[PDB]
Design a protein around this ligand. Sequence first.
Ligand SMILES: CC(C)CN(C[C@@H](O)[C@H](Cc1ccccc1)NC(=O)O[C@H]1CO[C@H]2OCC[C@H]21)S(=O)(=O)c1ccc([C@H](C)O)cc1
Lengths: 99, 99
Amino acid sequence: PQITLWKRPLVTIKIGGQLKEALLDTGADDTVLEEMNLPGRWKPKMIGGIGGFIKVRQYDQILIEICGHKAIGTVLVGPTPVNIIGRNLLTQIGCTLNF
Amino acid sequence: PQITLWKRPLVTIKIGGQLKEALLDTGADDTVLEEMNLPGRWKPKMIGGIGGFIKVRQYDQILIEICGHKAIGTVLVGPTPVNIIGRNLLTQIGCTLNF
Ligand SMILES: CC(C)CN(C[C@@H](O)[C@H](Cc1ccccc1)NC(=O)O[C@H]1CO[C@H]2OCC[C@H]21)S(=O)(=O)c1ccc([C@H](C)O)cc1
């Protein structure tokens, strides 16, 4: 589809069997999701933005579906105020900026 | 143009007569630039990011050129880790996401 930027580019995603709202964020190298209890191994990581850093848990090879488009890659889980779909997954679904 | 997301969507911007590199950030409501001097009046404002809230100087009706497209809108100046072009200006240049 085509998503304008009048409002936040929020879309429905499906990760680990659950549906959520997430931000298609060209400003994020990687995907960051709100706190959730995923299974599997993980490694700790610190990620930074406006306001400082937060501690996240990095999971690898996580499948999420974005508006019917399947994508699998690295997902960071921690106390983010919003679910963020980063370029690592935006590319897999064929997402581009256009102006 | 059409911009793929396998690399950071960095572009050259012109502001206050100076050129700078900025990130096209669809996950940002507002445009936030690193410390710099801009002409005109400004009011103090707060903005939140992934890591918390920071103090910024709000400049209204600033002229910015992004890849040749002119925009006139609000520019926030403060301790952001990266110069980010937010949706307030991305809409002015007719930017959209597509997939
Ligand atoms: C700063 C840019 C360079 C990076 N960021 C993406 C940016 O899109 C954020 C996303 C966001 C964060 C909190 C609440 C809403 C949106 N937007 C933003 O800060 O916007 C500001 C300005 O306008 C206002 O609107 C919203 C909040 C305010 S990050 O989140 O910090 C991030 C860092 C590292 C990774 C991995 C490790 O690669 C992924 C994501």
